[PDB]
Write an enzyme that holds these catalytic residues in place. Structure first.
Site, short mmCIF file in Angstrom:
data_model
loop_
_atom_site.label_atom_id
_atom_site.label_comp_id
_atom_site.label_asym_id
_atom_site.label_seq_id
_atom_site.Cartn_x
_atom_site.Cartn_y
_atom_site.Cartn_z
CG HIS A 214 4.71 -8.20 4.97
ND1 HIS A 214 5.62 -7.89 5.96
CD2 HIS A 214 4.68 -9.55 4.90
CE1 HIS A 214 6.11 -9.01 6.46
NE2 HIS A 214 5.56 -10.03 5.83
CG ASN B 106 3.87 -13.06 7.31
OD1 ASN B 106 2.97 -12.57 7.99
ND2 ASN B 106 4.73 -12.32 6.63
C1 E64 Z 1 6.30 -4.91 -1.60
C2 E64 Z 1 6.94 -5.28 -0.27
C3 E64 Z 1 8.40 -5.67 -0.46
C4 E64 Z 1 6.81 -4.10 0.68
C5 E64 Z 1 8.07 -3.33 1.10
N1 E64 Z 1 8.29 -3.48 2.53
C6 E64 Z 1 9.47 -3.75 3.08
O1 E64 Z 1 10.52 -3.94 2.43
C7 E64 Z 1 9.45 -3.82 4.59
O2 E64 Z 1 9.31 -2.58 5.29
C8 E64 Z 1 8.71 -5.08 5.02
C9 E64 Z 1 8.79 -5.32 6.50
O3 E64 Z 1 7.66 -5.55 7.11
O4 E64 Z 1 9.86 -5.31 7.09
C10 E64 Z 1 7.92 -1.86 0.74
O5 E64 Z 1 7.11 -1.49 -0.11
N2 E64 Z 1 8.70 -1.01 1.41
C11 E64 Z 1 8.84 0.40 1.08
C12 E64 Z 1 10.22 0.93 1.39
C13 E64 Z 1 10.15 2.11 2.37
C14 E64 Z 1 8.93 2.99 2.12
N3 E64 Z 1 8.41 3.60 3.34
C15 E64 Z 1 8.55 4.89 3.65
N4 E64 Z 1 9.63 5.44 3.11
N5 E64 Z 1 7.75 5.63 4.43
#
Ligand code: E64
Length: 209
Positions: free
Chosen positions: A157, A173
């Site tokens: 997040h 948040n």
């Molecule tokens: C470091 C912060 C920006 C975390 C980031 N999370 C997001 O952009 C969102 O999913 C956040 C959210 O809660 O909507 C993240 O790492 N997302 C990963 C992208 C998708 C990876 N997940 C898969 N492909 N299973």
């Protein structure tokens, strides 16, 4: 540095938001940082659009994923971001309109990794966006007091550190005013790579003048 600093009382931080049932943490966070840097040098406090980001930062993935080192570059290489009023939120991706460039920045600079002693520096100069492990129960079910609780690093997040204290952080948040402490959550300070890894991927937008 100043033992305790709050950018919310300075009139630099806008009211709490709500990303909705959409994975756009990456936009909300990286955007509220460009909001407070523009309300510091310029003196104007505007609420920019998280939607112009979900619809135009193709590099990313609207409602399902996003990173900081790609939301920022978007906003600079494009001349700027548009306000919320203009480009309201819809809670889902779509085409990318003819929006204006109301604000912008020169770049973005990363803070020394797993180093909170100096992260308190950046957060002492301006809100810094960070990543955390916001999937735990106690985390997701935090409400009041200073959160020590369970959570393993491995960020998922994105949010905004808008202040701090002798032993805790003032994290911002994006889940409405009904979560945590009026939308916010105070996370203890110091620990190594941080609580829920807070000091692993620090970052903040810069500006000229
Ligand atoms: C470091 C912060 C920006 C975390 C980031 N999370 C997001 O952009 C969102 O999913 C956040 C959210 O809660 O909507 C993240 O790492 N997302 C990963 C992208 C998708 C990876 N997940 C898969 N492909 N299973």
């Amino acid at each position: 540095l100043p033992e305790h600093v709050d950018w919310r009382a300075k009139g630099a931080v806008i009211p709490l938001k709500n990303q909705g049932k959409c994975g756009s943490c990456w936009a909300f966070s990286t955007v509220t940082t460009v909001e407070s840097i523009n309300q510091i040098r310029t003196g104007n406090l505007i609420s920019l659009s998280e939607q112009q980001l979900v619809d135009c930062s193709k590099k990313n993935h609207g409602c399902k994923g996003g990173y900081f080192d790609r939301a920022y570059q978007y906003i600079i290489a494009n001349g700027g971001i548009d306000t919320e009023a203009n480009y309201p939120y819809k809670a889902f991706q779509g085409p990318c309109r003819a929006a204006k460039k109301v604000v912008r920045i020169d770049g973005c600079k990363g803070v020394p990794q797993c180093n909170e002693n100096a992260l308190k520096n950046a957060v002492a100069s301006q809100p810094s966006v960070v990543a955390i492990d916001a999937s735990s129960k106690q985390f997701q079910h935090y409400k009041g007091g200073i959160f020590t609780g369970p959570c393993g690093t491995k960020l998922n997040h994105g949010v905004v550190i808008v202040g701090y204290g002798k032993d805790y952080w003032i994290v911002r948040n994006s889940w409405g005013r009904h979560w945590g402490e009026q939308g916010y959550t105070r996370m203890k300070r110091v620990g190594g790579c941080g609580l829920c890894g807070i000091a692993r991927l620090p970052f903040y937008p810069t500006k000229a003048x």
